[PDB]
Amino acid sequence: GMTEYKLVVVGAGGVGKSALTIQLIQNHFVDEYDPTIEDSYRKQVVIDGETCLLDILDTAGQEEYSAMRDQYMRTGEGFLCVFAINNTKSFEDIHHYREQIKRVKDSEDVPMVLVGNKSDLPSRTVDTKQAQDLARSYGIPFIETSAKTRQGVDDAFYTLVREIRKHK
Ligand SMILES: CN1CCC[C@H]1COc1nccc(-c2noc([C@@]3(C)CCCc4sc(N)c(C#N)c43)n2)n1
Ligand SMILES: Nc1nc2c(ncn2[C@@H]2O[C@H](COP(=O)(O)OP(=O)(O)O)[C@@H](O)[C@H]2O)c(=O)[nH]1
Numbered sequence: 001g002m003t004e005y006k007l008v009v010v011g012a013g014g015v016g017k018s019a020l021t022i023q024l025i026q027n028h029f030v031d032e033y034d035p036t037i038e039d040s041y042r043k044q045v046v047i048d049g050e051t052c053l054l055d056i057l058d059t060a061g062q063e064e065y066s067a068m069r070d071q072y073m074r075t076g077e078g079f080l081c082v083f084a085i086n087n088t089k090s091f092e093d094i095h096h097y098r099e100q101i102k103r104v105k106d107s108e109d110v111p112m113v114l115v116g117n118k119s120d121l122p123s124r125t126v127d128t129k130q131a132q133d134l135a136r137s138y139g140i141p142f143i144e145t146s147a148k149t150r151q152g153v154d155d156a157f158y159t160l161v162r163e164i165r166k167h168k
């Protein structure tokens with residue numbers, strides 16, 4: 001049977017979670033997508049010759065630490081922690097998202113990838129070295145992406161699938 005992978009995209013508002021997810025689903029750059037819409041989207045993909053079913057949850061809205069929201073996030077098997085390379089605050093928030101994932105999954109080894117988005121822009125404020133060194137502190141991969149140009153989009157999602165496969 002075809003394996004389904006439940007992936008969750010997290011990070012500050014405005015980093016490009018929706019743009020990244022829609023590039024994967026539609027193969028098109030969407031510069032405008034209602035910042036309040038949180039929803040899930042499926043796509044069949046060939047990753048290393050195997051057709052698998054991705055189920056991507058694109059998160060949005062206010063932080064809520066209810067038993068219901070924890071249960072909803074606990075459905076994720078792997079997480080993309082996204083920041084924007086021209087927004088220092090989004091990068092400085094990443095540790096919070098990682099700590100919340102570790103708590104809900106009750107595990108120090110949850111499949112995760114650090115994503116530096118907006119790599120097409122010239123306004124960089126977060127050095128690639130600092131981002132690579134944060135992923136090294138966590139023991140996870142780092143991928144540079146652009147939802148505008150498609151840079152790194154399959155690398156981010158497919159690497160997360162490969163981290164889930166090794167975790168099982
Ligand atoms: C002063 N703040 C703290 C630093 C940044 C600043 C603002 O932080 C901020 N803003 C919005 C959302 C979040 C946020 N953190 O984790 C989560 C998720 C979705 C991640 C996945 C695992 C869980 S489990 C659960 N219940 C969640 C929820 N709501 C989550 N989202 N953080
Ligand atoms: N140049 C550029 N802008 C992007 C990129 N990804 C998203 N954006 C823009 O960043 C803003 C926020 O994007 P959105 O996908 O709504 O972020 P979300 O709140 O994390 O879902 C919008 O103005 C998008 O056009 C990218 O890689 N490059």
Ligand SMILES: [Mg+2]
Nearest residue numbers: 017018035060
């Ligand atoms: Mg969004």
